[PDB]
Design an enzyme around this catalytic site. Structure first.
Site, PDB file in Angstrom:
ATOM      1  CD  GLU A  15      35.429 -80.396  19.252  1.00 31.31           C
ATOM      2  OE1 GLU A  15      34.937 -80.588  20.544  1.00 31.31           O
ATOM      3  OE2 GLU A  15      35.755 -79.328  18.953  1.00 31.31           O
TER       4      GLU A  15
ATOM      5  CG  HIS B  94      35.310 -80.625  24.345  1.00 29.39           C
ATOM      6  ND1 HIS B  94      34.636 -79.658  24.889  1.00 29.39           N
ATOM      7  CD2 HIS B  94      35.444 -81.741  25.017  1.00 29.39           C
ATOM      8  CE1 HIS B  94      34.272 -80.389  26.269  1.00 29.39           C
ATOM      9  NE2 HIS B  94      34.375 -81.710  26.223  1.00 29.39           N
TER      10      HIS B  94
ATOM     11  CB  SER C  11      30.269 -78.080  24.740  1.00 29.62           C
ATOM     12  OG  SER C  11      30.413 -79.344  25.060  1.00 29.62           O
TER      13      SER C  11
END
Ligand SMILES: O/N=C/c1nc(CCCCNc2c3c(nc4ccc(Cl)cc24)CCCC3)ccc1O
Ligand SMILES: O/N=C/c1nc(CCCCNc2c3c(nc4ccc(Cl)cc24)CCCC3)ccc1O
Ligand SMILES: *[C@@H]1O[C@H](CO)[C@@H](O)[C@H](O)[C@H]1NC(C)=O
Ligand SMILES: *[C@@H]1O[C@H](CO)[C@@H](O)[C@H](O)[C@H]1NC(C)=O
Ligand SMILES: *[C@@H]1O[C@H](CO)[C@@H](O)[C@H](O)[C@H]1NC(C)=O
Ligand SMILES: *[C@@H]1O[C@H](CO)[C@@H](O)[C@H](O)[C@H]1NC(C)=O
Ligand SMILES: *[P@](=O)(OCC)N(C)C
Ligand SMILES: *[P@](=O)(OCC)N(C)C
Ligand SMILES: [Cl-]
Ligand SMILES: [Cl-]
Ligand SMILES: [Cl-]
Ligand SMILES: [Cl-]
Ligand SMILES: [Cl-]
Ligand SMILES: [Cl-]
Ligand SMILES: [Cl-]
Ligand SMILES: [Cl-]
Lengths: 532, 532
Positions: A324, A437, A197
């Site tokens: 995501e 995610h 990330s």
């Protein structure tokens, strides 16, 4: 004694940690910068002045002052990413997991956490590196950096707070590894940074930044790239936010020197309670204080850097998870709940994409509406949430990263691209969020090998596949062992754009990840808004 | 006698002809207007002055001066649309087919031909009405109109060449039918106009035109509609093609009366030879002199007429063929050939999209492309060829028509919608062209009913099925017989939007014909270019 190690700043003593019926060494809470208290707040990191004696390095250090998620009080799926030590501004420390017996000169992986540059801890249960260091005989290193206002307040022209400062703590952590890892059995010539990330974004920016190129050898980027819309802001608006944060807390705004002195004798929750308001009047996957394009840490805009190949040429291994954007809907959008299917009307799907593309004009909203809509079925409650969750995923990571990969591959010495699409068996989160995610991290760090965690046998199999891909990539620059009989993960070539699926099944090779959506996001929509 | 009929303009003596082992009576080449020659070129029609003595109506009339097609000399697939009689400016005639015994106030169907307003003939063999007249017991009329510059040259503001005279030719013929069809057994109160392509757009424009609306009762539109992009121009463009017409023939252009004078001394093929030179763009599927939005035939813009509901409210039956684009691509686009499978290179594809949307700027083409391309497979000759057939078809026929259907249906009193996707089994064109536009017409005029033309026994049943749909539509405003028996053809309703297949397979019902692409073509791209 292998738990006492004399570093360039002072002597350190770790602790014997158990791991899978065996033990390995751990040195936790080692400091790499002088603590940024007081006047030091907002400034570039200073290296830690050496200390006398033995530094008790047997506990986790503190976490950095940051927002604390309380959308779901006491819910394991959300607490797991919250601070688990106390918070302090004296937070610049790194952890090290050495195998035992101690290797003479072995590969080093440095982990960089995400959390949106507004949060993150090196001490989460899910970043506990004892399983990867021991199972793969690597030296694992968790670093930590300032987040929020503390690491990313930008007042360009000022050296009391220049911006990109939180990135410089990772560089100083990095230089600390380059100066000292050798005494923990690390080879500084084979450091692999790897983040997820905002971590994967930071990896990519060290790739870009001239000041950080020579402090690591390769690079692994998970679900994040430097050109993500949310991961940078230009210098002007970067100031802007620093100066609306002032207006938001009764500061002086006839200067930078007192706009700043105004923001140092604050205690820290005071700035986190108000961190969130200074944005372009919408969030949905945009965060307050993030790296700035400052002409120094980044010499140019990133687009022109990747265009000229002005970056470190090496190997990268990178990928995304399938879904995501579910987290950002869940916590923001209309009619997304943890405890419904979050089926979604058309009326609130339109308001979805107006949130989801902050900047878009009237015609941009109509474009994005039209490529994610089944017009034979426009109030289909599922296709509408599935659709809009793909907009946020496609636009904010998947397509931004695929840009990075296509531009990069033209210059570097190898790219490996993965599509992580395994929904975990024990996932506490709703099914409709898919492969969120963050939940491939638990597999990179071998957590499925702990059988009290009630993962399936095929997920131990898959975390071992992934750990060996990751570590072998960190040694050899290539995920695969040669001399090998397992199915080989093909290089991503600028022509055929191959990549792989990571999951419990035997592996598969696909070509060109999400092309149709990414031609629209990276080549056509930018031209629509550039158009007057 | 029976073939001696005395009209409001004099007596006509027509001929008794054989039809399918039986006989019916035809009246061919009756004049409904005074010859549009000499000083009457580009002038509005004049009613045919009454004739003493009998009009020998035993043979087909002349055809209006046209461009004749010659890419494939001898090829019946193209010749069947070329004039099959002498061409002449004296060409305003209509032909009537009357069943025998002559009926008593029965249903009238008037046919208008297509040909892009630059060509067409009432005398072709596929427009031979004797089969439909006979088997459905209706009176079949086919009119004619001046085409090309002769019919649609427009210098709005002159009364000598006002433009749309060619549509006034069709109305003049409708008025002839309103005043005399009763004397042939026709019912002037149950008159159905219908036509294909430019003939279809023409019935569309008599729906809009207040000077035309009372001359008929319902309407069938085949593969065309008034609002089609090739079907109209503004007063300003029509003028400027008029003056460039003159300029190509070194005409004096100081005024209209000079320019219009200068253009009437020219032999007819002198205009035809330079007709195509005045198109503003390199383009496929545009024609030079087409009906003009002038403020008389069309009070206001066609969109605001369709919006305010200012049109004839009745029933319509209308539709499209599967592959409208195929014809024009063969003739005007690169990579296309009559004798290969016409696989299109990607480079040739982009050439084809610039010709199909010639009024589009740079951003508009990247829009059209991104929407018709599989980016996983962008050098797949088939998928490019087929995609381009779909661009030209949807841009020019299919999605103008749905826009018309939807808007009309809010006010009209009935709408039936068909998608003709049977490729005639005796078709002489290559199969990559699919269902050629216009090859529904063989089935509407019942040509599969004759066994020498080597049609398929199931194509005969399709032609009787179709002719009957068309005919009871004409009689009752619903192509189903109230004898609730077979598959019923649903009403197209603004909400559910049902339509049907016509093929040899038993009939099925679908909804939202090509909705996803028409939203791009009716609602997205127009908003793109109004803004860029
Ligand atoms: O997406 N969720 C967005 C979001 N949540 C909340 C929950 C309570 C405040 C916590 N603070 C927020 C958080 C975030 N964004 C914010 C954007 C704007 C603002 Cl005023 C606050 C935000 C994102 C991570 C979760 C924390 C409020 C408004 C939001 O718009
Ligand atoms: O489909 N295009 C076909 C086409 N055939 C020709 C052959 C003869 C010269 C003038 N004939 C025409 C022209 C045009 N349209 C036509 C459409 C159909 C037909 Cl039979 C003729 C056309 C447009 C450009 C000007 C020329 C040239 C260019 C074309 O592109
Ligand atoms: C280091 O700290 C731990 C944590 O409380 C403690 O148990 C240990 O005794 C300490 N070791 C030394 C040498 O002070
Ligand atoms: C890596 O670099 C070497 C030489 O510097 C070159 O020969 C080799 O082909 C490169 N490999 C890739 C995948 O670019
Ligand atoms: C009508 O014209 C045709 C064609 O010239 C001719 O053969 C026929 O004899 C004519 N009939 C009459 C009754 O004049
Ligand atoms: C047509 O009009 C009549 C009354 O004028 C009405 O009863 C009928 O339902 C209408 N049908 C449609 C399809 O509009
Ligand atoms: P990452 O830091 O996710 C944590 C919320 N990123 C996608 C911004
Ligand atoms: P139509 O008249 O077909 C003849 C070529 N055209 C679509 C305008
Ligand atoms: Cl354990
Ligand atoms: Cl933003
Ligand atoms: Cl499983
Ligand atoms: Cl290994
Ligand atoms: Cl290999
Ligand atoms: Cl189709
Ligand atoms: Cl529409
Ligand atoms: Cl309705």
């Amino acid at each position: 004694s292998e738990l006492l190690v004399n570093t360039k700043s002072g002597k350190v003593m770790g602790t014997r940690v158990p791991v899978l019926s065996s033990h390995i060494s751990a040195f936790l809470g080692i400091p790499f910068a002088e603590p940024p208290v007081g006047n030091m707040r907002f400034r570039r990191p200073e290296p830690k002045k050496p200390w006398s004696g033995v530094w008790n390095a047997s506990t986790y250090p503190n976490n950095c002052q940051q927002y604390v998620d309380e959308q779901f009080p006491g819910f394991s799926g959300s607490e797991m990413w919250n601070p688990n030590r106390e918070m302090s501004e004296d937070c610049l420390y790194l952890n090290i997991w050495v195998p035992s017996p101690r290797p003479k000169s072995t590969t080093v992986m440095v982990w960089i956490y995400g959390g949106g540059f507004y949060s993150g801890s090196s001490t989460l249960d899910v970043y506990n590196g004892k399983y990867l260091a021991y199972t793969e005989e690597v030296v694992l290193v968790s670093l930590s950096y300032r987040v929020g206002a503390f690491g990313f307040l930008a007042l360009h022209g000022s050296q009391e707070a220049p911006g990109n400062v939180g990135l410089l703590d990772q560089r100083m952590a990095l230089q600390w590894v380059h100066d000292n890892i050798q005494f923990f059995g690390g080879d500084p010539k084979t450091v692999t940074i790897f983040g997820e990330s905002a971590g994967g974004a930071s990896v990519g920016m060290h790739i870009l930044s001239p000041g950080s190129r020579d402090l690591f050898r390769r690079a692994i980027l998970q679900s994040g790239s430097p050109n993500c819309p949310w991961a940078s802001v230009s210098v002007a608006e970067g100031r802007r936010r620093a100066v609306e944060l002032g207006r938001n807390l009764n500061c002086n705004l006839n200067s930078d020197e007192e706009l700043i002195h105004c923001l140092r004798e604050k205690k820290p929750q005071e700035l986190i309670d108000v961190e969130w308001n200074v944005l372009p009047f919408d969030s949905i996957f945009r965060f307050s204080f993030v790296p700035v394009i400052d002409g120094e840490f980044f010499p140019t805009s990133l687009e022109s850097m990747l265009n000229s190949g002005n970056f470190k040429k090496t190997q990268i291994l990178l990928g995304v998870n399938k879904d995501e954007g579910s987290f950002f809907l869940l916590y923001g959008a209309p009619g997304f709940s943890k405890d419904s299917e979050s089926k979604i009307s058309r009326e609130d799907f339109m308001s979805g994409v107006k949130l989801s593309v902050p900047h878009a004009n009237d015609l941009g909203l109509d474009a994005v509406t039209l490529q994610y809509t089944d017009w034979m079925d426009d109030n289909n409650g599922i296709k509408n949430r599935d659709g809009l969750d793909d907009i946020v995923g496609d636009h904010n990571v998947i397509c931004p990263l695929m840009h990075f990969v296509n531009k990069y591959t033209k210059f570097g010495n190898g790219t490996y691209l993965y599509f992580f699409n395994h929904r975990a068996s024990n996932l506490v989160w709703p099914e409709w969020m898919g492969v969120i995610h963050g939940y491939e991290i638990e597999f990179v760090f071998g957590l499925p090998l702990v059988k009290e965690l009630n993962y399936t046998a095929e997920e131990e199999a898959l975390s071992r596949r992934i750990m060996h891909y990751w570590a072998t990539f960190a040694k050899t620059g290539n995920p695969n062992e040669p001399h090998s009989q397992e199915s080989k993960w093909p290089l991503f070539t600028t022509k055929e754009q191959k990549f792989i699926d990571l999951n419990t099944e035997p592996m598969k090779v696909h070509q060109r990840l999400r092309v149709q959506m990414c031609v629209f996001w990276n080549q056509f929509l930018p031209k629509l808004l550039n158009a007057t």
